[PDB]
Design a protein around this ligand. Structure first.
Ligand SMILES: *[C@@H]1O[C@H](CO)[C@@H](O[C@@H]2O[C@H](CO)[C@@H](O)[C@H](O)[C@H]2NC(C)=O)[C@H](O)[C@H]1NC(C)=O
Ligand SMILES: *[C@@H]1O[C@H](CO)[C@@H](O)[C@H](O)[C@H]1NC(C)=O
Lengths: 50, 50
């Protein structure tokens, strides 16, 4: 008796599960805006649920 | 006068016939990991033989 490999069952399909929302995150104002505060006092942009 | 005293004597004779497979353990059933593991060489054949 020899042991060569393992009985491996390949997956059938590719389930994908992402939250069902379609709100675009505002990256445009973050990347480029009229004024950016300097290093001594920099801002926090909390991107949430988009 | 004499006495007869039964004495128990325990002796291990064998242990569990374990077995380890690389691609199941070394790789979390992935493909690139399999490529790298086959790149390393024939350690797995030695392990299985042992
Ligand atoms: C040898 O030893 C045995 C065990 O101690 C003796 O058998 C006992 O004898 C006494 C009386 O002589 C009894 O009251 C016990 O019930 C016996 N025990 C058993 C388990 O049989 C035996 O008599 C001794 N022999 C001699 C020649 O002294
Ligand atoms: C940043 O530039 C993009 C490029 O067109 C623009 O769509 C976006 O409105 C700009 N963001 C601003 C002006 O805050």
């Amino acid at each position: 008796i020899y042991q060569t490999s393992n009985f491996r069952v390949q997956p059938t399909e590719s389930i994908v599960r992402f939250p069902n929302i379609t709100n675009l995150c505002p990256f445009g104002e973050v990347f480029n805006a009229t004024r950016f505060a300097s290093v001594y006092a920099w801002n926090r942009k909390r991107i949430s649920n988009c | 006068n004499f006495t007869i005293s039964v004495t128990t004597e325990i002796l291990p004779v064998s242990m569990t016939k374990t077995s380890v497979d690389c691609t199941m353990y070394i790789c979390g059933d992935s493909t690139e990991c399999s490529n790298l593991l086959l790149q390393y060489g024939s350690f797995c054949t030695q392990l299985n033989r042992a």
